[PDB]
């Protein structure tokens, strides 16, 4: 039944009720979409060289007995996703000392899968994907301390009311390259919770390259307390996109925009990249980013930003890249980008910018790339770009440029003189021909 080509046995959707006889040299087996009701020790007897095994989405109810994968010491990746009501016996992963990657997405697993001994045999485990299960409380068993190569955990879509110090005790001492806690909600961890003190620091003595906390709401008062609680945690790259509770949003003042205290807990984290896009932020308040003293990249794209207060960027001494694309900016002036002395890249595309102030880019001498495309600019002030002597690339297209002389004189000469900087080509509204081609008498 299976298609065996080279080292690969594709046994997808073949009406199998058991593991078939396969050539014993295969190193890759896909047994997805069959009706295997139960795996046990006899299932994979033949297949020693096996490195990659997928047994995804069997008919609901798959049972994996003790010692099913015993003797599969070459197995590196095991995918058991979408097995609805997966039943694992506690020694189900015996023999898997060499396994690096285990995925169990949407298998109706609860927190006992972490607190029990199911993963005790997986001493070489690197990567564990437990998305979209019924894990309500993250409580790794003590053997996790001895898993020296464990560095990726994906818990996306589990409904986790809270994560606390005592929950994550057995992750202390770990460095995670990726800890993905996205759309878990953390519903309990709000400002009216009586649990904050007892919760302590869930990431005590833990460090993280990428901490993905996207899709969790992060109301300002939650973000402040959560970052107060994990203060000191080394995080290189912070992802808080779709913090749908964070901004006040345009038109309402029920929730607060983040302010100069919101991210104080990240003072000592060493954050290099921060993603705050799609979070309904409407105003950048003074000093809101002041604790991000190592920050090099900041995206605030696709928020609702209409207002940037003076000193909104105070403290961002290392900031190289600022993305404000897809926001609601109506105009720019010099105060908006004060304190961004090292900035190299500014994306202001897809706003509603109708005017640039005389000295809009004054405090951006190192700007290399400036994106002003897709706004609503009829004109720029004379000399606007003169101080930008490190500029390499500018975007100006998809704006209704008014090519009247002399209004257009400075920009057309500027674009003509700097033609290799222009990305795309700004057009006159009306005639539709290049701004750079206009010559004013």
């Amino acid at each position: 039944e299976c298609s065996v080509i080279g080292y690969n046995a594709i046994c997808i959707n073949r009406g199998l009720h058991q593991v078939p006889e396969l050539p014993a040299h295969v190193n890759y087996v896909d047994l997805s979409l069959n009706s295997i009701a139960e795996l046990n020790e006899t299932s994979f007897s033949r297949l020693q060289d096996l490195q990659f095994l997928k047994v995804e989405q069997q008919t609901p109810g798959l049972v994996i007995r003790n010692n099913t994968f015993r003797g599969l010491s070459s197995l590196i990746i095991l995918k058991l996703d979408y097995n609805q009501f997966l039943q694992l016996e506690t020694g189900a992963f015996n023999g898997l000392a060499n396994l690096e990657v285990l995925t169990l997405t949407q298998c109706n697993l609860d927190g006992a899968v972490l607190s029990g001994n199911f993963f005790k045999p997986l001493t070489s485990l690197e990567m564990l994907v437990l998305r979209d299960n019924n894990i309500k409380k993250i409580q790794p068993a003590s053997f996790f301390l001895n898993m020296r190569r464990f560095h990726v955990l994906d818990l996306t879509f589990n409904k986790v009311k809270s994560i606390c110090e005592e929950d994550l005790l057995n992750f202390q001492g770990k460095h995670f390259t990726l800890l993905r806690l996205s759309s878990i909600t953390l519903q309990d961890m709000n400002e009216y919770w009586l649990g904050w003190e007892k919760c302590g620091n869930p990431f005590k003595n833990t460090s993280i390259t990428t901490l993905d906390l996207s899709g969790n709401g992060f109301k300002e008062s939650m973000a402040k307390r959560f970052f107060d609680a994990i203060a000191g945690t080394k995080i290189q790259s912070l992802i808080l996109s779709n913090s749908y509770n964070m901004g006040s949003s345009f038109g309402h003042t029920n929730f607060k925009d983040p302010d100069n205290f919101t991210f104080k807990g990240l003072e000592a984290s060493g954050v290099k990249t921060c993603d705050l896009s799609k979070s309904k932020i409407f105003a950048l308040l003074k000093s809101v980013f002041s604790h991000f003293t190592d920050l090099e990249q900041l995206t605030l794209a696709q928020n609702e930003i209409n207002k940037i207060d003076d000193n909104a960027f105070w403290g961002l001494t290392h900031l190289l890249k600022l993305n404000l694309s897809q926001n609601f900016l109506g105009s720019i002036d010099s105060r908006m980008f004060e304190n961004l002395d090292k900035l190299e890249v500014l994306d202001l595309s897809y706003n509603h910018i109708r005017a640039l102030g005389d000295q809009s880019f004054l405090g951006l001498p190192n700007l290399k790339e400036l994106a002003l495309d897709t706004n609503q600019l009829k004109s720029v002030p004379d000399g606007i770009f003169d101080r930008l002597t490190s500029l390499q690339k500018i975007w100006l297209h998809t704006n209704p440029w008014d090519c009247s002389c002399p209004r257009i004189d400075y920009l057309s000469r500027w674009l003509n003189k700097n033609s290799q900087k222009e990305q795309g080509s700004a057009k006159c509204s009306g005639s539709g021909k290049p701004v750079r081609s206009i010559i004013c008498p």
Binding site: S3, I5, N8, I10, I12, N13, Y28, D30, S32, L33, Q51, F52, E56, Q57, I76, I77, D81, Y82, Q84, V101, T105, Q106, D132, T185, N190, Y192, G215, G217, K219, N242, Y244, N245, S249, G251, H252, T253, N254, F255, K280
Partner: protein
């Protein structure tokens, strides 16, 4: 693999729109948690409700606009059969569901309805509030005026109440005989000392007598619960329990949103399982291997 690819696009289109809806529901939920647990003026509840209304409307707009190749993926319970196999047996069915404000149980969902009147809330949102509390010391019934705190008998023509100079007992006598020392005016503490039991209050508000319970939390006019309502401009008015029910704040707002949430989540899970199905059917046709690194 063409139809299986379309199956994927439909499933991605629906998943994206469900996520938008989920985020709006979760924001509505947090707004509601704020309305319930925050200290919230009348004006704050209206602002919150204005935002909730706008989010509910964003849900209906997503429901109404989201489409892939003609198909309005959230508009109707529709079982889409996608043929995944050359030989004509392999169909995979996408289970599409009507998801909009009405179907999620959220029509009329609100958080700024009228609240049951309380003694505290009366004396916090009205003026010229007169009346008294009743105390009972066994057989004897007493009235304690509010604002003055004066202790009087609970009769048609009420007598002033004083405190016995020797005993501490309650009495209507101005003084006591000797062998006259004045009795001091009675106070709440004198009824408390004397073991009196708090009964019902009679609270007059804009010239209308209301009966409050001992604890002061339930107010009734002719045996019907009273609710305080406020105009846009901010004038407090007292209404009955039946004219209240129409404009009521939604009972169990959290449970209503969670219901909506789990209904949105169930379609989301289903879509995830169905995309894994499509992914496998494409890899089965191409005979494609994923690589260890790419994994």
């Amino acid at each position: 693999s063409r139809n299986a690819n379309d199956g994927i696009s439909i499933a991605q289109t629906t998943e994206g729109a469900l996520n938008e809806i989920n985020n709006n529901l979760q924001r509505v939920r947090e707004l509601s948690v704020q309305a319930t647990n925050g200290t919230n003026s009348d004006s704050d509840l209206k602002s919150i409700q204005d935002e909730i209304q706008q989010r509910l409307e964003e849900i209906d707009r997503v429901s109404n606009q989201t489409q892939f190749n003609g198909v309005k993926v959230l508009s109707q319970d529709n079982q889409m059969k996608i043929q995944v196999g050359a030989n004509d047996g392999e169909t995979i069915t996408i289970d599409l569901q009507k998801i909009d404000v009405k179907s999620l149980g959220l029509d009329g969902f609100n958080v700024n309805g009228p609240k049951e009147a309380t003694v505290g809330d009366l004396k916090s949102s009205f003026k010229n509030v007169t009346g008294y509390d009743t105390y009972a010391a066994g057989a004897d019934k007493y009235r304690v005026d509010i604002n003055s705190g004066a202790v009087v008998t609970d009769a048609v023509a009420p007598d002033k109440v004083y405190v016995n100079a020797a005993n501490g007992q309650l009495t209507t006598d101005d003084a006591e005989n000797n062998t006259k020392t004045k009795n001091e005016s009675a106070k709440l503490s004198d009824l408390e000392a004397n073991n009196a039991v708090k009964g019902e209050s009679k609270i007059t508000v804009n010239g209308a007598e209301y009966t409050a319970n001992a604890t002061g939390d339930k107010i009734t006019l002719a045996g019907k619960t009273m609710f305080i309502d406020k105009t846009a401009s901010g004038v407090s008015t007292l209404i009955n329990e039946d004219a209240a029910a129409a404009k009521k704040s939604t009972a169990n707002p959290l449970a209503s949103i969670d219901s909506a949430l789990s209904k949105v989540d169930a379609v989301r899970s289903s879509l995830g399982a169905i995309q894994n199905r499509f992914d496998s059917a494409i890899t089965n046709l191409g005979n494609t291997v994923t690589n260890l690194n790419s994994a």
